[PDB]
Write a protein that binds this ligand. Structure first.
Ligand SMILES: [Zn+2]
Length: 7
């Protein structure tokens, strides 16, 4: 899967 982190 793809992953995204929005801090
Ligand atoms: Zn993955």
């Amino acid at each position: 899967g793809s992953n995204q982190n929005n801090f």
